[PDB]
């Protein structure tokens, strides 16, 4: 097999911007979890409507 030298090469700023994009990724997963939590809130509350 082997390894290319492109993985070795990196500019100063692109590494920073990629780290920023990784910092965006955690907040995307955050968004997913919040959406899931609010959706199950909808599901329980609109049937607590029926129960009450």
Interface residue list for other proteins (CB under 8 A): 3, 7-8, 10, 15-16, 19-20, 22-24, 26-27, 30-31, 33-34, 37-38, 41, 45, 48, 52
Q: How far is the CB of 48 from other proteins (least distance, A)?
A: 5
User: Of the candidates 21, 1, 19, which has an alpha carbon nearest to the alpha carbon of residue 10?
Assistant: 19
**How far apart are CB 16 and other proteins at their closest, in Å?**
5
Question: In which element (H, E) is residue 11 found?
Answer: none
* Smallest separation, CB 6 to other proteins (Å): 9
Residue 51 class from Cβ within 10 Å (0-12 exposed, 13-18 middle, 19+ buried)? exposed
């Amino acid at each position: 097999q082997g390894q290319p030298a492109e993985e070795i090469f990196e500019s100063v700023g692109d590494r920073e911007l990629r780290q920023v994009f990784e910092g965006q990724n955690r907040i995307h997963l955050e968004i997913k979890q919040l959406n899931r939590q609010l959706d199950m809130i909808l599901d329980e509350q609109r049937r607590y409507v029926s129960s009450l």
